[PDB]
Amino acid sequence: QQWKVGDKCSAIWSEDGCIYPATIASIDFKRETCVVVYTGYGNREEQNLSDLLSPI
Incomplete structure (x- = not known):
């Protein structure tokens, strides 16, 4: 629990709608958001x- 910088999570893509490995690079408690990095794709x-999925 408790999301922090540098964590292996899972995020869905808005291109095909599928689950793919991710890594929380930055977070903004202000607007309760964060940035995930697509392991292998580089895209962020x-x-x-609240939409962050647990690792595999």
């Missing part, structure tokens, strides 16, 4: 902490 997209 902003998502909601």
